[PDB]
């Protein structure tokens, strides 16, 4: 067995023994001395020592008698110093022998007290003994005091006289150490398990289970409770807490050195006082501060706060070294300084290739400094290292030639701050260019958030062959042409390149040279650059296009095409294996991006990279040839701008007449006036797109006018190069409406555009949105950056383990349709996904579509003709793969062109794919197909106005076509108006059902007058404004905001006839009195007659924070109520306006009841057969409620759809596979129902229980089948439950984790990615994954 | 803060005793010490030890300090004169032999012998010992007590437990006799079941009594006389120590009044009181009730002495001596004077004139007086950085220089290989190349077959060939350093 090999695999943490501290130590620190004032050297036996810790000089003694590297490991007889290197002062430690036992602060003050839970004693009782105020009973017999009893000095005196001798009680920290000495761990666990048999409890059970979990973990590791109180105190090495002379001459010392002195000082005094007369008052006080001295040394920010001897600052304690945002544990990742690194301002590089960057000459000479010396002595140009150093410094002409040789074929990484996704660091092969600025490729600039105006980039250089290869094979820009977030390419031409291809492809009416036959695309270049024909005009060209063959490649179709001169030249740029139809159209940013996407799957990776550069070179050349210029005349104002404004300007003054008269109220005016300017702003914008969009008119050939305008501004907007249609609105047409500091919109918008001079008032108005929008942007990076940090820490420790997981189960995927519009088709949704079950849809004759296969970009085209719906594909959620993803049962790699290879970290990509683009962050049923409306469970009643309002809780809508079959299915809620009844023919494009989306109306049954009984104004009801009908309406307040005068009053509307007597409700002889709940808004007045079907009262129900809320699994303000057990369910009893739901099935036992709030409107009336997971209260659904009842599938698709809806509105494309990775990290950790091996509640992983259930049911001597229920933990609730203390203390609170690891005796085997970064080992992901498998396999055998 | 509050509440219960109340405690202190001094005078070995240790220093010629200052200090019933030192220890030796013949005759302390033992104690009480020498005299009775009761416990172990014997019969037998063997063998004569089964361990019980009865010949007192003094000595020690506690406890409030003034210096507030309490320990031990003056005035000097000594010894990181501390305090007093009397600032040329010290002394102390700066001192903040972050390490050698050292040893090895066989061995010994030890010209000559003078010739011959530009072009590149 190896003994001296430092190659470790696992690290463990436990409590240190007083004898174990002496093993670390090499001597005892007895003096508080440091350094002499005369000669700057260590003193005798102080903090700084050469006899204990090591010599200050390299291989020398203190006196200077022993010199030269001759002597090694020689213990001096004159001084006592070992002749060794001074690095020994960094590793060697010391010890301080304490005269009195002092308690540890980490186990005492840190909640919920490690010493307190172990002894079953509150902190108030422990501290009063420790601090020396009261005695505590340790040993018990027949002394009436039993155990842990707190006794004062006057109580202890009388108790000893009555008994004594056999009775044992001590005072101070000595008593606590003796109390932990006497306790038996083997017998305490047996007693607690016996009492948890008859009296179990529910809420008080948690503290009883906490004690067992603390005691059982204490014995299995073997820490011993006696070491909780410190007797020997370890000392840090002198190098970590140094006294170094600065440049000026004044010394600089650590705050730890000042703390250590105030420990030894009173330690030496206590050793004196114990033999030089010991009065209790002084001795207890010296022990009082000595306990505080260690407390201030370990963790200063707990008991009091120590002040530095010279400075007015809290001293950096031993705990403060690890934590504090920037310490030692947290600087392993963030605060890491790196050699072989550069930094300069970025510049454009149009002459460079995609794999090439323009690295500065003087920077590269400095960076590859050791690389120059290596290939200079090898060439025979320089004699030695020092001679090679002189040649570099003198800047010799021959050095520049060798420099280029080393840089060639050597990749260099380029990093930009901040890195949101992985493409922020890309490798490039440098080309030497003279200058102090670094040149970057224009195409890869789209990957970063970079702009050539004042941005800087870090220049990193790999050193080893392994580092050079993983930069070329993985981190190279040519290899990373696609984005990891979505299947669309990230390297897409922008600005100048788009404008160049747009002008080249666009056509004119009659340009120079039209109607020629042209021999090949070569003659198209012959006419333009010579000066005989323009790029525009429709001219026939002979072209030879090559289509893809079934085997490839023999198809060569030649035909005459009707294009332009410019389109023919661009075909030469287009590779052979691509159709001509893709370049035939006028190309913009939307069209050019489609060229690279099609070129990738059809040809490969290599052909599209060369093509990508070829577009860029040609893009800049023809953009320069065109000469696009933004002029003041190009900013065309609509012909009748002020004419439209004047029609809407005094139209506001027309409603100002209604403001004073009383036709339109003051509250209704503001929202009516604003609609005029909103319509006027759109009218000017639409009129702007006539004098700018197609304004040409002058045509030489014929008399026509139809042509796309050659305006410089429109060319930048139509192509999508720079500036959208929204930007052109403000400059030429109208700026629009601005906001107020409160949030409301200003009455009069800015009429003046940027073409004309803005007013002083108008410009001050526009500044508010400028200093508010940019203020949001200043904290947008901080908020989205924390969101990126949040998603990583929970999913980072997730890598691909197996090639295929043995489950034919996944998620049902349907194209997202909102109301009657398709957002994303099946092709874009199921692209990349691997199917779990074969396609069984009938349409065209075939022999089945194979399962467990990758859906290609060409394979998905076959599914489009057949029109397939609802395909269950293998996803990240449904995985039984030990600890990770199962490759095949996941999907394609979006950056690559095939399946994702095993070893790649999915969770890190999944977190970056959402955090990066995060910076940019139904009501009426309409039918198109002709048929007939058939209704079931109809309870409609016609009112006085003429609205068919239904008086039923559950209503469904169905359509019957020509043949006689159901077409569409839609749900109709309570309080809805139907257009047509049962069996009525509908036309193509007609609304059949209509209701207000954000309200819950209450419908009456009996007709007559309305009485306001117990409806006193001011006491129960208040007046405001309803924002739906609307006007002034009564608002009913809940039982919380009501006055002290009207305490017992029920808000209810009473229905009477013409005489004044109550009209009875059909069924019961009870008077008609509809009790109205809280929050409800009453629209009706006193004395107003209503018919059957009239509404009495209506009951009311962001961006980045919404995404953060869904991922954190936080319950909404108004959670939806759902039925838990299926069967015959009926209501029970009444209170005021609330119902207690009693759910009882048919079978045995089944005791269940529920309590529901009063204001809630239900979807069931009386005696209803309800199933598991049904909507009772309409609105938002609670994330925990869906998992509880609907299952572990409907909740997973709920997280996907709700998050995507936020990104769809903003215009962001993120795949559904990235979200479901984090969902799997939310579903982990489950609660056990059936008794297995340990407890009932606890916290065990889903797969940890799946390994358990597979082992218990067959072998392992258990035979019990542990039933488990899935639990949901939103990121931060799941990231705390990591099975590593090194990974936890990285982002979590350090002092809590290190104490928990010490007590339990945890072992970190280093499997997570974050665990190996801190220790300085290879990552169990990617290249290091194949390395890591070699060591994990040899743990079982050996 | 917690520790400051309750300390004031612990001594708050103890009330101050003044005037004649102080004397009541002070009388028990001096009577407590005197009772111990009576116990030392009764002990026969203490008289022998005082005569034995006297000849240890007197034989080594006439001295003044160190050991003699610990002894003598006489009081009839500072530099000690040799005339009196020889005189006082003279009658003590005479009383040692005259009070011995009466002990041998008849009983131990028989009438006339009792009169002379009391006369012998009067001569011993004449001397006063310094704590350094006084402690070992008490240890001559403390350690010897752990030899009487320990051996009696061994006798009790192998008779009461081993033979299973009642404890009632042990009282009369092991008190009235003690010395003779008329308790061990006399119990068997009565003939009893638990008395006859004592022969199994008879070779350990009364045999171990030779480490108990020998003490009677070693010291000079019987078992009855040994226990009578040792138990009485523990009384006087408990009398003084416990009474000294009451004097300290009552005067704890006086310590705080002085400690509050020296708070702004360096040390913590509670450290001043705890050290001041140690100063109060000295203010009771040296205090007498025969003084006839206020206790508060005498205590203030001793409390202040403990604070002032510790405030310069500790507090600072680097320790500054007592003499150097006084000059730093002198600097600050004149700095306040010269700043406003002249106008601007005191220069080293002008500051040295009033201090009566040379310029090289003042300008040296100014650097030493400065306290070492904290490691975590914030400089500008913004991106959050400390003073300890910008400090570079000069101990580490450059990786370029580390490669140069490796290249130099590799180059010289090829250089020495070009030399003619024996030429390489000489240079590797003369300069210690690739060898652990460096050799001198005389050492090579005797271990290389050749003469002494020849070594100097071939050394320069080996150097000359390496001084040539054609051969050593690689070695000339290292000359840049
Ligand atoms: N301008 C431009 N050139 C490209 C592009 N892609 C590849 N090349 C050129 O093609 C040459 C070979 O590239 P490879 O990738 O090795 O192609 P291969 O495997 O089929 O041989 C290189 O020449 P080389 O560097 O001289 O290498 P070699 O020919 O000395 O091996 C490189 O300059 C591109 O997008 N733009
Ligand atoms: Sr940009
Ligand atoms: Sr910028
Ligand atoms: Sr020879
Ligand atoms: Zn030495
Ligand atoms: Zn799987």
Tokens standing for A1342?
């050996």
Interatomic CA distance for residues A541 and A571, integer angstroms: 11
- Do A963 and A1084 reside in the same domain of the chain? no
Interatomic CA distance for residues A1109 and A1127, integer angstroms: 34
Does B392 reach chain A within 8 Å, measured CB to CB?
no
Pick from B241, B372, B403: which is nearest to A385 by CB?
A: B403
Nearest to B40 by CA among B134, B108, B157: B134
Cβ contacts of A481 within 8 Å, gap of 6 or more:
A489, A490, A491, A596, A600, A605, A608, A609, A612
- Do A655 and A766 reside in the same domain of the chain? yes
Residue appearing with tokens 């005791």: A1151
Find residues 248-267 of chain B whose CB sits inside 8 Å of chain A.
248-249, 252, 266
Helices within B395-445 (DSSP H only): 399-417, 422-430, 441-445
**Residue A412, phi-psi category: left (phi > 0), alpha (psi -120 to 50), beta (remainder):** beta
Resolution of the coordinates, Å? 4.2
Residue numbers in B near A316 (CB within 8 A)? 375-376
Nearest to A1008 by CA among A1050, A1069, A1071, A953: A1071
Q: Which strands form A1008-1011's sheet, in the order they lie side by side? A: A1073-1075, A1052-1056, A1008-1011, A1089-1090
**Pocket residue to mutate for ligand 1, from A353, A354, A442, A573, most atoms within 8 A of Cβ:** A353
Burial A702-726 (b: 16+ CB within 10 A, else e): eeeeebebebbbbbbbbbbbeeeee
> Taken in order A103, A106, A110, A116, is the CA torsion positive or negative?
negative
Find residues 322-341 of chain B whose CB sits inside 8 Å of chain A.
324
The verdict on a CB contact (< 8 Å) between B376 and A255 is yes
**Residue B265, phi-psi category: left (phi > 0), alpha (psi -120 to 50), beta (remainder):** alpha
Cβ contacts of A244 within 8 Å, gap of 6 or more:
A251, A252, B391
Interatomic CA distance for residues A718 and A157, integer angstroms: 97
Q: How far is B337 from chain A (nearest CA, A)?
A: 25
First CA to last CA distance, chain A? 10
Say if residues A745 and A765 touch (Cβ distance below 8 Å).
Answer: no
| Chain A residue with the nearest C-alpha to that of B373 | A252
Query: DSSP assignment, residue B209?
Result: G
Beta-bridged to residue A1082, according to DSSP, are: A1034, A1097
First CA to last CA distance, chain B? 60
Residue numbers in A near B478 (CB within 8 A)? 384, 386
As to burial, measured by CB atoms within 10 angstroms (0-12 exposed, 13-18 middle, 19+ buried), residue A1127 is middle
Tokens standing for B304?
């202040």
Query: DSSP assignment, residue B268?
Result: -
For ligand 1, whether the C-beta of A1203 sits within 6 Å is no
Q: Is the peptide bond before A868 cis (omega within 30 degrees of 0)?
A: no
Nearest to A783 by CA among A484, A1226, A485, A1103: A1103
The DSSP bridge pattern shows strands A425-430 and A356-357 to be parallel
Nearest to B150 by CA among B227, B230, B220, B212: B212
- Do A761 and A662 reside in the same domain of the chain? yes
Residue appearing with tokens 């293998």: A874
- Do A703 and A735 reside in the same domain of the chain? yes
**Number of residues in chain A:** 1342
Pick the residue of B244, B319, B439 with the most A CBs within 10 A to test the interface with A by mutation: B319
Q: What angle do the packed helices B91-98 and B44-52 form, to 10 degrees?
A: 140
Q: In degrees rounded to 5, what are phi and psi of residue A518?
A: 55, 115
Interatomic CA distance for residues A832 and A1216, integer angstroms: 11
Residue appearing with tokens 């079982």: A1340
Tell me the residue range of the domain where A973 lies.
924-994
Q: List the shell of residues around ion ligand 6, using CB closer than 5 Å.
A: A 805, 879, 881, 886, 889
Q: List the shell of residues around ion ligand 5, using CB closer than 5 Å.
A: A 61-63, 76, 78-79
Interatomic CA distance for residues A1089 and A1102, integer angstroms: 42
Pick from B3, B11, B248: which is nearest to A288 by CB?
A: B3
How far, in Å, is the centroid of ligand 2 from the Cα of A449? 5
- Do A981 and A1085 reside in the same domain of the chain? no
The CB-side HSE value for A372 (13 A sphere, CA atoms) comes to 24
Interatomic CA distance for residues B119 and B122, integer angstroms: 5
Interatomic CA distance for residues A1268 and A1245, integer angstroms: 10
The verdict on a CB contact (< 8 Å) between B407 and A383 is no
3-state secondary structure of A314: strand
Q: Which helix (H) or strand (E) holds A343?
A: strand A341-348
The verdict on a CB contact (< 8 Å) between A253 and B314 is no
Pick from B241, B277, B478: which is nearest to A282 by CB?
A: B277
- Supply the CATH number for residue A1080's domain: 2.40.50.100
The DSSP bridge pattern shows strands A93-103 and A25-28 to be parallel
- Do A1012 and A988 reside in the same domain of the chain? no
Cβ contacts of B258 within 8 Å, gap of 6 or more:
B276, B300, B303, B304, B307
Nearest to A408 by CA among A380, A432, A435, A379: A432
**Number of residues in chain B:** 481
Nearest to A308 by CA among A347, A246, A261: A261
Beta-bridged to residue A414, according to DSSP, are: A426, A459
For ligand 1, whether the C-beta of A333 sits within 6 Å is no
Nearest to A486 by CA among A554, A423, A539, A550: A423
The DSSP bridge pattern shows strands A251-253 and A341-348 to be unpaired
Does B401 reach chain A within 8 Å, measured CB to CB?
no
Interatomic CA distance for residues A1186 and A1197, integer angstroms: 10
Tokens standing for A53?
């810790």
Tokens standing for A94?
């010391």
3-state secondary structure of B325: helix
Residue appearing with tokens 């060439």: A379
Interatomic CA distance for residues B176 and A157, integer angstroms: 39
Pick the residue of A71, A129, A277 with the most B CBs within 10 A to test the interface with B by mutation: A277
For ligand 1, whether the C-beta of A353 sits within 6 Å is yes
Residue A593 CA: distances (Å) to CA of A257, A491, A1048: 64, 9, 70
- Do A653 and A765 reside in the same domain of the chain? yes
User: How many Cβ atoms from other residues are within 10 Å of residue A150's Cβ?
Assistant: 17
- Do A690 and A751 reside in the same domain of the chain? yes
Pick from B387, B407, B473: which is nearest to A252 by CB?
A: B387
> Taken in order A865, A870, A876, A879, is the CA torsion positive or negative?
negative
Residue numbers in B near A86 (CB within 8 A)? 395
As to burial, measured by CB atoms within 10 angstroms (0-12 exposed, 13-18 middle, 19+ buried), residue A297 is buried
Provide DSSP, A684-725. HHHHHHHHSSS-----SSSS--------HHHHHHHTTSS--H
Residue A1223 CA: distances (Å) to CA of A809, A1219, A1272: 16, 6, 9
Query: DSSP assignment, residue A1170?
Result: E
Interatomic CA distance for residues A80 and A103, integer angstroms: 34
Helix count and strand count (H, E) for chain A? 40, 46
Q: Which atom of ligand 1 is nearest to the CA of A353?
A: 36
Beta strands in A920-1037 (DSSP E): 924-927, 931-936, 940-942, 948-950, 955-960, 966-972, 977-978, 984-986, 990-994, 1000-1003, 1008-1011, 1021-1025, 1032-1036
Interatomic CA distance for residues A659 and A230, integer angstroms: 82
Cβ contacts of A1104 within 8 Å, gap of 6 or more:
A780, A783, A784, A787, A918, A921
User: How big is the CA angle at A581 (ends A580 and A586), to the nearest 5 degrees?
Assistant: 110
Say if residues A126 and A303 touch (Cβ distance below 8 Å).
Answer: no
Residue numbers in B near A285 (CB within 8 A)? 3, 7, 10, 270, 274
As to burial, measured by CB atoms within 10 angstroms (0-12 exposed, 13-18 middle, 19+ buried), residue A1035 is middle
The verdict on a CB contact (< 8 Å) between B376 and A316 is yes
For ligand 1, whether the C-beta of A352 sits within 6 Å is no
- Cα dihedral A419/A420/A426/A431 (nearest 10): -50
- Supply the CATH number for residue A729's domain: 1.10.132.30
Nearest to A920 by CA among A1218, A1212, A1219, A1205: A1212
> Taken in order A1201, A1206, A1210, A1213, is the CA torsion positive or negative?
negative
Nearest to A15 by CA among A82, A102, A104: A104
Does B472 reach chain A within 8 Å, measured CB to CB?
no
Q: How far is A1317 from chain B (nearest CA, A)?
A: 22
Interatomic CA distance for residues A832 and A850, integer angstroms: 15
Interatomic CA distance for residues A1308 and A10, integer angstroms: 5
User: How big is the CA angle at A645 (ends A641 and A647), to the nearest 5 degrees?
Assistant: 120
Say if residues A444 and A426 touch (Cβ distance below 8 Å).
Answer: yes
The verdict on a CB contact (< 8 Å) between A244 and B275 is no
Q: Which atom of ligand 1 is nearest to the CA of A478?
A: 35
The verdict on a CB contact (< 8 Å) between B373 and A251 is yes
- Do A762 and A649 reside in the same domain of the chain? yes
> Taken in order A224, A225, A231, A232, is the CA torsion positive or negative?
positive
- Do A644 and A768 reside in the same domain of the chain? yes
Say if residues A378 and A390 touch (Cβ distance below 8 Å).
Answer: no
Q: Which strands form B373-374's sheet, in the order they lie side by side? A: A244-245, A251-253, B373-374
Provide DSSP, B161-205. ITTT--SSHHHHHHHHTSSSSTTTSTTTTT--HHHHTTGGGHHHH
- Do A658 and A738 reside in the same domain of the chain? yes
- Do A988 and A1020 reside in the same domain of the chain? no
Interatomic CA distance for residues A201 and A997, integer angstroms: 46
Helix count and strand count (H, E) for chain B? 25, 1
For ligand 1, whether the C-beta of A355 sits within 6 Å is no
Cβ contacts of A797 within 8 Å, gap of 6 or more:
A907, A1282, A1287, A1311, A1312, A1313, A1314, A1315
The verdict on a CB contact (< 8 Å) between A243 and B372 is yes
Beta-bridged to residue A1008, according to DSSP, are: A1090
For ligand 1, whether the C-beta of A613 sits within 6 Å is yes
Residue appearing with tokens 């008698």: A65
Q: Which strands form A1127-1134's sheet, in the order they lie side by side? A: A1139-1142, A1127-1134, A1168-1170
Cβ contacts of B58 within 8 Å, gap of 6 or more:
none
Say if residues A180 and A225 touch (Cβ distance below 8 Å).
Answer: yes
Nearest to A624 by CA among A733, A528, A496: A496
Q: In degrees rounded to 5, what are phi and psi of residue A1023?
A: -115, 130
Query: DSSP assignment, residue A732?
Result: I
């Amino acid at each position: 067995a190896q003994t001296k090999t430092e190659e470790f695999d696992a690290i463990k943490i436990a409590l240190a023994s007083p004898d174990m501290i002496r093993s670390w130590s090499f001597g005892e620190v007895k003096k508080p001395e440091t350094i002499n004032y005369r000669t700057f050297k260590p003193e005798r036996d102080g903090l700084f020592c050469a006899r204990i810790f090591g010599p200050v000089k390299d291989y020398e003694c203190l006196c200077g008698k022993y010199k030269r590297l001759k002597h090694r490991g020689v213990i001096c007889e004159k001084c006592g110093v070992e002749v060794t290197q001074t690095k020994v002062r960094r590793e060697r430690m010391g010890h301080i022998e304490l005269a009195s036992p002092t308690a540890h602060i980490w186990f005492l003050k840190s909640l919920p007290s490690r010493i307190g839970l172990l002894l079953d004693m509150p902190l108030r009782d422990i501290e009063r003994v420790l601090y020396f105020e009261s005695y505590v009973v340790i040993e018990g017999g027949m002394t009436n005091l039993e155990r842990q009893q707190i006794l004062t000095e006057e109580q202890y005196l009388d108790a000893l006289e009555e008994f004594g001798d056999e009775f044992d009680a001590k005072m101070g920290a000595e008593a606590i150490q003796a109390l932990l000495k006497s306790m038996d761990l083997e017998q305490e666990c047996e007693q607690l398990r016996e009492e948890l048999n008859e009296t179990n409890s529910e809420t008080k059970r948690k503290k009883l289970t906490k004690r067992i979990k603390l005691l059982e973990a204490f014995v299995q590791s073997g820490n011993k409770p006696e070491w909780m109180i410190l007797t020997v105190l370890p000392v840090l090495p002198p190098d970590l807490r140094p006294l170094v002379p600065l440049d000026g001459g004044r010394f600089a010392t650590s705050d730890l050195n000042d703390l250590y002195r105030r420990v030894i000082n009173r330690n030496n005094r206590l050793k004196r006082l114990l033999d030089l007369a010991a009065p209790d008052i002084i001795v207890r006080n010296e022990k009082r501060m000595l306990q505080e001295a260690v407390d201030a040394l370990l963790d200063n920010g707990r008991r009091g706060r120590a002040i530095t001897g010279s400075n007015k600052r809290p001293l950096k304690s031993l705990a403060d070294m690890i934590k504090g945002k920037q310490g030692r544990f947290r600087q392993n990742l963030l605060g890491k300084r790196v050699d072989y690194s550069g930094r300069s301002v970025i510049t454009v590089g149009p002459y460079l290739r995609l794999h090439q960057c323009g690295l500065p000459k003087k920077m590269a000479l400095e960076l590859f400094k050791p690389f120059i010396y290596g290939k200079l002595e090898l060439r025979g140009l320089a004699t030695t290292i020092k001679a090679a150093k002189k040649m570099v410094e003198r800047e010799e002409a021959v050095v520049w030639d060798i420099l280029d040789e080393v840089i060639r074929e050597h990749p260099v990484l380029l990093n930009r701050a901040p890195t949101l996704h992985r493409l922020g660091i890309q490798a490039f092969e440098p080309v030497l260019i003279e200058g102090k600025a670094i040149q970057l490729h224009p195409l890869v600039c789209a990957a970063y958030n970079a702009d050539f105006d004042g941005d800087q980039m870090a220049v990193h250089v790999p050193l080893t062959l392994e580092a050079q290869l993983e930069a070329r094979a993985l981190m190279m820009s040519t290899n990373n042409i696609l984005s990891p977030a979505n299947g669309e390419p990230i390297i897409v031409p922008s600005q100048d390149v788009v404008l160049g291809l747009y002008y080249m492809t666009r056509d004119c009416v009659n340009a120079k040279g039209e109607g020629m036959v042209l021999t090949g695309p070569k003659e198209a270049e012959r006419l333009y650059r010579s000066g005989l024909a323009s790029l525009h005009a429709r001219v026939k060209v002979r072209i030879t296009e090559y289509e893809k063959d079934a085997n490839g490649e023999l198809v060569a179709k030649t035909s005459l095409k009707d294009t332009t001169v410019g389109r023919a030249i661009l075909w030469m740029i287009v590779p052979k294996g691509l159709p001509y139809s893709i370049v035939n159209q006028a190309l913009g940013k939307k069209a050019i991006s489609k060229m690279l996407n099609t070129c990738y799957r059809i040809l490969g990776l290599k052909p599209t990279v060369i093509f990508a550069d070829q577009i860029m070179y040609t893009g800049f050349a023809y953009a320069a040839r065109s000469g696009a210029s933004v002029g003041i005349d190009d900013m065309v104002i609509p012909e009748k701008k002020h004419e439209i404004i004047s029609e809407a300007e005094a139209e506001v003054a027309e409603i100002q007449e209604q403001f004073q008269s009383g036709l339109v109220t003051a509250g209704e005016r503001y929202n009516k006036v604003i609609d005029i300017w909103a319509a006027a702003n759109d009218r000017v914008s639409k009129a702007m797109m006539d004098n700018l969009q197609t304004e040409t008119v002058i045509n030489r050939d014929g008399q026509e006018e139809k042509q796309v305008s050659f305006n410089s501004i429109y060319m930048m907007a139509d192509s999508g190069a720079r500036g959208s249609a929204a930007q052109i609105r403000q400059l030429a047409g109208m700026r629009g409406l601005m906001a107020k500091p409160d949030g409301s919109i200003i009455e009069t918008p800015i009429t003046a555009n940027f073409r004309e001079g803005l007013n002083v008032l108008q410009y001050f108005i526009s500044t508010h949105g400028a200093r508010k929008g940019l203020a949001d942007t200043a904290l947008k990076t901080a908020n989205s950056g924390y969101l990126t940090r949040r998603l990583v820490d929970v999913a980072q420790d997730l890598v691909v383990t197996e090639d295929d997981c043995g489950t034919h189960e996944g998620i049902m995927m349907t194209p997202v349709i909102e109301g009657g519009d398709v957002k994303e088709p099946l092709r874009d949704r199921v692209l990349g996904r691997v199917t779990a079950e074969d396609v069984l849809k009938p349409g065209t004759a075939d022999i089945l579509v194979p399962r467990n296969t990758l859906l290609h970009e060409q394979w998905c085209d076959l599914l489009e003709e057949n029109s397939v719906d609802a395909v269950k594909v293998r996803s990240v959620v449904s995985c039984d793969t030990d600890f990770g993803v199962c490759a095949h049962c996941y999907g394609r790699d979006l950056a690559r062109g095939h399946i994702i290879n095993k070893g790649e970290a999915i969770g890190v990509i999944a977190a970056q794919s959402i955090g990066e683009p995060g910076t940019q962050l139904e009501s009426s049923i309409q039918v198109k197909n002709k048929g007939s409306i058939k209704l079931s469970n109809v309870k409609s009643v016609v009112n006085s106005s003429g609205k068919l309002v239904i008086t039923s809780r559950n209503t469904e809508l169905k359509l019957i076509d020509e043949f006689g079959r159901t077409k569409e299915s839609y749900k109709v809620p309570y309080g809805a108006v139907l257009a047509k009844g049962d069996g009525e023919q509908v036309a193509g494009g007609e609304t059949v059902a209509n209701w207000d989306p954000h309200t819950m109306p209450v419908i009456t049954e009996v007709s007559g007058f309305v009485r306001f009984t117990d409806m006193i104004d001011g006491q129960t009801i208040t007046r405001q404004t309803d924002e739906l009908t609307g006007l002034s309406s009564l608002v009913v307040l809940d039982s919380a905001e009501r006055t002290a005068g009207g305490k017992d009053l029920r808000p209810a509307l009473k229905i009477v006839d013409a005489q004044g007597n109550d009209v009875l409700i059909p069924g019961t002889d009870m008077p008609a009195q509809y009790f109205l709940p809280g929050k409800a808004i009453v629209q009706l007045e006193d004395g107003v007659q209503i018919s059957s079907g009239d509404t009495l009262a209506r009951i009311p129900q962001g961006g980045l924070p919404r995404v953060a809320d869904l991922f954190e699994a936080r319950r909404p303000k108004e959670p939806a109520i759902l039925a838990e057990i299926s069967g015959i369910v009926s209501f029970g009893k009444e209170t005021k306006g609330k119902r207690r739901l009693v759910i009882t099935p048919v079978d045995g036992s089944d005791p269940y009841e529920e309590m529901i709030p009063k204001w809630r409107q239900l979807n069931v009336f009386e005696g209803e057969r309800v199933e598991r997971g049904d909507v009772i209260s309409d609105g938002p659904e609670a994330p925990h409620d869906i998992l509880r009842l609907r299952g572990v599938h409907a909740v997973t698709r709920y997280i996907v759809n709700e998050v995507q809806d936020v990104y769809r509105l903003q215009g962001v494309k993120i795949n559904d596979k990235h979200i479901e990775v984090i969902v799997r990290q939310m579903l982990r950790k489950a609660t056990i129902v059936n008794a297995g091996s340990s407890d009932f509640l606890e916290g065990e992983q889903v797969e940890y229980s799946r390994v358990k259930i597979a082992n218990r049911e067959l072998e392992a001597n258990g035979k019990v089948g542990a039933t488990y229920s899935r639990d949901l933990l939103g990121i931060t609730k799941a990231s705390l439950a990591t099975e590593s203390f090194i990974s936890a203390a990285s982002f979590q609170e350090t002092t809590r984790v290190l104490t928990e690891a010490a007590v339990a005796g945890k072992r970190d085997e280093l499997r997570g990615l974050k665990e190996n970064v801190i220790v300085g080992r290879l990552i169990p992901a990617g290249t290091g994954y194949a390395y890591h498998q070699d060591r994990m396999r040899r743990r079982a055998a050996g | 803060t917690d520790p400051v509050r309750m300390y004031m509440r612990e001594m708050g219960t103890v009330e101050l005793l003044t005037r004649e109340g102080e004397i009541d405690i002070a009388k028990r202190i001096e009577d407590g010490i005197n009772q111990v001094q009576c116990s030392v005078a009764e002990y026969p070995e203490a008289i022998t030890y005082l005569l034995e240790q006297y000849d240890r220093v007197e034989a080594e010629e006439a001295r003044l300090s160190d050991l003699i200052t610990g002894f003598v200090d006489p009081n009839a019933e500072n530099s000690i004169d040799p005339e009196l030192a020889r005189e006082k220890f003279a009658e003590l030796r005479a009383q040692y032999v005259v009070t011995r013949d009466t002990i041998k005759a008849k009983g131990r302390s028989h009438a006339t012998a009792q009169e002379e033992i009391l006369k012998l104690s009067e001569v011993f009480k004449q001397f006063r010992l310094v704590p350094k020498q006084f402690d070992y005299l008490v240890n001559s009775m403390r350690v010897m007590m752990d030899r009487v009761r320990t051996q009696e416990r061994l006798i009790m172990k192998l008779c009461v437990e081993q033979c299973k014997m009642p404890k009632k019969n042990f009282i009369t037998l092991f008190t009235g006799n003690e010395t003779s063997d008329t308790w061990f063998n006399a119990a068997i004569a009565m003939n009893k079941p638990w008395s006859e089964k004592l022969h199994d361990v008879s070779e350990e019980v009364h045999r171990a009594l030779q480490k108990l009865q020998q003490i009677e010949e070693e010291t000079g007192l019987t078992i009855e006389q040994v226990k009578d003094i040792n138990r009485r000595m523990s009384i006087g020690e408990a009398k003084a120590r416990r009474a000294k506690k009451e004097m300290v406890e009552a005067n704890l409030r006086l310590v705080i009044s002085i400690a509050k003034k020296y708070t702004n210096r360096g040390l913590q507030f509670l450290d001043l009181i705890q050290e001041g309490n140690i100063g109060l320990m000295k203010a009771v031990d040296k205090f007498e009730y025969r003084r006839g003056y206020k206790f508060s005035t005498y205590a203030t000097w001793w409390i202040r002495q403990a604070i002032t000594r510790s405030i310069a010894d500790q507090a600072r990181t680097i320790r500054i001596p007592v003499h150097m501390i006084e000059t730093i305090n002198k600097l600050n007093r004149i700095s306040r004077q010269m700043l406003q009397e002249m106008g601007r600032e005191p220069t080293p040329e002008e500051l040295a004139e009033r201090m009566l010290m040379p310029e090289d002394k003042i300008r040296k102390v100014l650097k030493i007086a400065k306290e070492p700066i904290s490691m975590e001192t914030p400089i500008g903040d913004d991106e959050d950085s400390h003073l300890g972050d910008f400090i570079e390490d000069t101990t580490l050698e450059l990786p370029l220089d580390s490669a140069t050292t490796e290249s130099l040893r590799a180059a010289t090895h090829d250089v020495l290989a070009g030399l003619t066989a024996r030429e390489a061995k000489v240079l590797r010994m003369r300069f210690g190349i690739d060898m652990n030890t460096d050799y001198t010209l005389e050492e090579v000559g005797k271990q290389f077959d050749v003469t002494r003078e020849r070594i100097r010739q071939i050394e320069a011959k080996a150097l000359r060939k390496l001084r040539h530009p054609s051969r050593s072009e690689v070695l000339r590149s290292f000359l840049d350093d």
